[model samples]
Target chain A: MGRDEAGITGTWYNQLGSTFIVTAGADGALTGTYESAVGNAESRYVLTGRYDSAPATDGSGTALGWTVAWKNNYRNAHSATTWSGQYVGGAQARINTQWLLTEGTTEANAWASTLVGHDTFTKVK
Target chain B: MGRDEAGITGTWYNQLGSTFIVTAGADGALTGTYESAVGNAESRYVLTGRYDSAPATDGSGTALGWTVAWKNNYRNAHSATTWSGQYVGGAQARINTQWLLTEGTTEANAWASTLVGHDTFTKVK
Candidate 1:
């Protein structure tokens, strides 16, 4: 289990039941799809980012970073969410993720331009 | 201990002996300094990022992210490093960190444009 497609290519579900289908690529590139559990649960948003060049042998899995440019608008929140994580593989494979969501353009007095969240993803496939 | 100076403002060290002095701020903003152990040990780089709205009760600390633009050039690696972590505060306060270092602009065939590393940090002050 490493940085190859066989190492991390699979269906993953976060704590919120959102789905992430990942395919590890060359030169640390990562391609995936994100199915939101929040709004726009129907569309599988495109995921793009990079990762550790070397395959992770321990729990750190180097570092995982990716972003989803959500296509649809929810409450005018046409936002993009970036996720950072460490993937651990084996019989109990999981990814501990910290996410930052940059929200839609808001009014000057709008509250919270960004939202922070933490989730753990377990490989279901 | 939640997201506050009393909770997370202090001197911290990573496995590499790199230094991170953090100050948790209003609305999850973080102001800090990072002294590199690898290069430019003399320079304490400026750090800016955000954290969880609420201080971390567990290790997640909601989510923590920051970056430092290295002012000096190291082998032409005048780069910026972004770190992502989860802050845990207690008698043994620590941060589980994953870092992505974007290297110097290089040729298409140059090795590893971005490097990834993981280090757990312990609060010393």
Candidate 2:
């Protein structure tokens, strides 16, 4: 069969207590909210990214990329985190992803300027 | 943390007694087997699709699309069904998906020619 595209519209959950609600726009824009478990205010941050319209690596799923302000202040070190993941559908629908959070974007200390972590987001809604 | 991509390298099943054993390729392709419960021969049909690599709509999940020829004859009507779904990760990890099997590519029955169906696949492996 030929290649095809899919969508991501729902609520997502992780073990850390972080949550997200996704909405696909008519303009091909992917928008949603993010709530971090580590923050003091527990504010729902604005999620910004695009749904990769490209066909899946294997033609089974689609990939997307997005970022959020974790610290709520762009000037703050390690304030933002971005994700690029693959969506594999099923009963426990899964997305295995790795993330990179920023600290300082300087070349000298660039090695330590970013934090790395990974999580498999699950859909509870 | 940052955005990370996920993987779907396991088995899938549905209520129709059909099952699949999926194997992902490092070359960015998905290959699997479809054991049909309806066919008399019940031969394992080849499954093809790619994992979507775009960022999810809201920022939490990813979507995928794939297809399989049910009749083993491409020239036959409604021989293939393509599924596109969102993989929401979890302990049970699932993929909520929808499928379309076409009857013809003509004008008269464009609307009803394609068979529409939706299913939630479970990862038993």
Candidate 3:
């Protein structure tokens, strides 16, 4: 589970929890896989997102990175949706990333909102 | 080896190369051991440092985390000196953390400088 400065917390589940994790850097750019913890193909969709981690690099002094707050989501096979949050500190100052997964489908039909989630994280840890 | 904004690169040695490493969050706070790669007793040191990863958390919007740059250092046993670096992006904006270890001892002499190193990282991966 993760928490935001606003007092919001999130949770991660099973395989979706284990597989779909983010490798975040101080720059706020992230890379990882979004795998669903369930069944044999055709229910999960791919996921991807990125945000600014810090203000920028000026070649001197201290800069705080972002904090991993909370995450939670459900995965089927071909399509999936998820929510994640993180926060960073520096000259840019005072901001958080709240991820929300919405209106999506794997089987090629009108998109349906199977998962709707959001959370916030602070650069506390 | 590691890279810096000035395009300076550093190298990590065999034993002085292992052990001493950093675990950084998007906010730039780091926690880890500064164990000398080569030593018996009087060469290791405890390392603690933190930097701004991005910006402050304002509870709404996108905040990027810190980028894990490259780090290299030498360690002994009782007391050690090492260097580490990280970068982040956000509203607080533009900054990086470059850690340097310096003088001291178990027997406690006036002082001594052992190792020097630095590196830079881009969020490409």
User: Model 3: per-residue lDDT, tens digit, A14-115?
Assistant: 323323344543322334443344333333222222232222233211211222212223322221232322233343322222222222122232233233
When just chain B is superposed on the true chain B, each candidate scores a TM-score of 0.80, 0.73, 0.34
Return the lDDT, model 2, position A64. 47
- Order the candidate numbers by TM-score, best to worst: 1, 2, 3
Model 2's alpha-carbon lDDT is 0.51
Clash count, one per candidate: 1, 61, 76
Per-prediction TM-score: 0.48, 0.42, 0.24
Candidate 3 displacement at residue A71 in angstroms: 26
**DockQ score for model 3, please?**
0.02
Which window of 10 residues has the lowest lDDT sum in candidate 2 chain B? B70-79
Model with the higher lDDT, candidate 1 or 2: 1
> How well does candidate 2 score on lDDT at residue B37?
63
Rank order by DockQ, top first? 1, 3, 2
Residue B107 lDDT in candidate 3 = 19
List, residue by residue over A4-120, the lDDT tens digit for candidate 2.
123367777876778877775432234667787764436675564444333324334444445554333322222445554545566667654555554323234434544556656
